[PDB]
């Protein structure tokens, strides 16, 4: 039995107004309102093109959506809805169907985003440092407001390069946390599922979101992307075995109970520990310090209760800089 050691009563606390979102009675805008000025990328959930309000003349991201389910669609509005307004949370501006093929769309605030294939590799130490802080006051944020993202990675976090804005986005993935709930594991990218997902362990929490944010995180310091290149579910607990060793994997396994598929288990085998500079080399010289691998350590950790909490993250003296600029 595991329960988030933070924030863990937030939805049983309020009203039925706030975390019951299959009541939502979703309020359709005019489509005309919005015209397409580009695509900008696709994915088996969406459509992405760049957008413009015709009565404002202000940008916009278009997000035309596959077919999907009435329970999921409501799901995502109305997380949407609760978090507007937080810290570096996305914005929804609209929601609109076509009337013959009742397709949906929603309509978000527009990020001039850069590919982080080609942004990344240009970040400085700080500017890694000041990001990470930024991504971590929207993690707190709808963590605080009993909600899971589950699905922390770069492609979900737009920024601005030029005028340092960053927002995290595409909340179709996330969850309300109640406690003791079992949700689905089959959630987040491959690269970013953390053990919980891929051992099977049902009742995960808030947590989650920390261990992929840890991926992104030692994959910016490290410059190798993704860090944990497994190339299917269980590839990827291996990849992540053969790094935090299989001593710490056991030892999780044993605390919750929890037995690995024969064929699984095969497949990690023993390994041992590897310390965090063995990924060290003279490309991520200027970025591995002794604070940032401290604050990793304390991110990829295979037990999700040991993790540190977003608000324990921003806290971390790896960050004190960007705090002391921004106050
Ligand atoms: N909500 C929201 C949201 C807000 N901006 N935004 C953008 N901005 C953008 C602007 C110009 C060029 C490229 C993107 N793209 C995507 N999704 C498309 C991207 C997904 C990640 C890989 C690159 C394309 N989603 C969003």
Redesign the pocket.
């Known amino acids: 039995m595991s329960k988030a050691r933070v924030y863990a009563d937030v939805n049983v606390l309020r009203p039925k107004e706030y975390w019951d979102y299959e009541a939502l009675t979703v309020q359709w805008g005019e489509q005309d309102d919005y015209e397409v000025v580009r695509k900008?990328?696709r994915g088996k959930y969406s459509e992405?093109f760049?957008g413009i309000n015709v009565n404002n003349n202000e940008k916009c991201?278009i997000?035309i959506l596959k077919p999907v389910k009435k329970k999921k669609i409501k799901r995502e509005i109305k997380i949407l809805q609760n978090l507007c307004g937080g810290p570096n949370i996305?914005k929804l501006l609209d929601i609109v169907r076509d009337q013959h093929s009742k397709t949906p769309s929603l309509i978000?605030?527009?990020?001039?985003?850069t590919?982080f294939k080609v942004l990344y590799p240009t970040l400085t130490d700080y500017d890694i440092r000041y990001y990470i802080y930024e991504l971590l006051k929207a993690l707190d944020y709808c963590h605080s407001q009993g909600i899971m993202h589950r699905d922390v990675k770069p492609?979900n976090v737009?920024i601005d390069h030029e005028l340092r804005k960053l927002?995290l986005?595409?909340w179709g993935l996330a969850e309300f946390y109640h406690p003791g709930k079992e949700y689905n594991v089959r959630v987040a990218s491959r690269y970013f599922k953390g053990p919980e997902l891929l051992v099977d362990l049902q009742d995960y929490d808030y947590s989650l979101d920390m261990w992929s944010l840890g991926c992104m995180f030692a994959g910016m310091i490290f410059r190798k992307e993704p860090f944990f290149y497994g190339h299917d579910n269980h590839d990827q607990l291996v990849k992540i075995a053969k790094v935090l060793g299989t001593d710490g994997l056991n030892a999780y396994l044993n605390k919750y109970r929890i037995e690995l598929d024969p064929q699984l288990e095969a497949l990690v085998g023993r390994h041992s520990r590897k310390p965090w500079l063995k990924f060290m080399n003279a490309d991520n010289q200027h970025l591995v310090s002794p604070e940032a691998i401290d604050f990793l350590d304390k991110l990829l950790r295979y037990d999700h209760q040991e993790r540190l909490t977003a608000l324990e993250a921003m806290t971390h003296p790896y960050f004190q800089q960007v705090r002391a600029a921004e106050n």
């Open positions: 900008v990328g992405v760049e991201i997000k996305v978000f605030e527009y990020v001039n985003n590919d492609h737009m927002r986005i595409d």
